[PDB]
C-alpha cells in the first residue's frame, strides 16, 4: 500500500507514535517518506546481507526473521514479511522497540541525515489529526 502523507500521519497517530519517546509525529512521517516513500512493500538489501522492510525499513540484522540473514536477531519476534502489510501495526510496534534501544531515532539513517534538525512539523501541515 502506498499511503498518502496525511493518511500515514493519522495511522501513526492512532497507533501511538505522536511524541513516542519524545518524537513528534512529523519526525515519524519524515522518516517514512525518506525510508520507503510511504510504501508498505518497500524492501532494500543492505551491504552486510540483511534487508530492510516496510514503511520504516526495519532491519533483519536485529529486528525480524527473513530466513536469509545469518547470525542475526529477531528482537520484534516477527517474520519480516509482516512488516510489508497494508496494516502498519507490526511496523509501529517494532519501531517502538527500536527507538527505545538507546539511540532513539538515530537508528534510522534517513531520519538522522534528512529529518533531524529540520522543520519536521511541515510533514503534517494541512492534515486533519
Ligand atoms: Na534477523
UniProtKB/Swiss-Prot annotation:
Name of protein: Lysozyme C
BP GO terms, sorted: cell wall macromolecule catabolic process; defense response to bacterium; defense response to Gram-negative bacterium; defense response to Gram-positive bacterium; killing of cells of another organism
A Pfam family that the UniProt record links to this protein: Lys
Gene name as annotated: LYZ
Disulfide bridge positions per record: 6-127, 30-115, 64-80, 76-94
EC number: 3.2.1.17
Alphabetic keyword roster: Allergen, Antimicrobial, Bacteriolytic enzyme, Disulfide bond, Glycosidase, Hydrolase, Secreted, Signal
Keyword Hydrolase tagged: yes
Further facts: Lysozyme C is capable of both hydrolysis and transglycosylation; it also shows a slight esterase activity. It acts rapidly on both peptide-substituted and unsubstituted peptidoglycan, and slowly on chitin oligosaccharides.
Organism per entry: Gallus gallus
Ranges annotated as spanning the membrane: none
Amino acid at each position: 500500500k502506498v499511503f498518502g502523507r496525511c493518511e500515514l500521519a493519522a495511522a501513526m497517530k492512532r497507533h501511538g507514535l505522536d511524541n513516542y519517546r519524545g518524537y513528534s509525529l512529523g519526525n515519524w512521517v519524515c522518516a517514512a517518506k525518506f525510508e520507503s516513500n510511504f510504501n508498505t512493500q518497500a524492501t532494500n538489501r543492505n551491504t552486510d546481507g540483511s534487508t530492510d522492510y516496510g514503511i520504516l525499513q526495519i532491519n533483519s540484522r536485529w529486528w525480524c526473521n527473513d530466513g536469509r540473514t545469518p547470525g542475526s536477531r529477531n528482537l520484534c519476534n516477527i517474520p519480516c514479511s509482516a512488516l510489508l502489510s497494508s496494516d502498519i501495526t507490526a511496523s509501529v510496534n517494532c519501531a517502538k522497540k527500536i527507538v527505545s534501544d538507546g539511540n532513539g531515532m538515530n537508528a534510522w539513517v534517513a531520519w538522522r541525515n534528512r529529518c533531524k534538525g529540520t522543520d519536521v512539523q511541515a510533514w503534517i501541515r494541512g492534515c486533519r489529526l
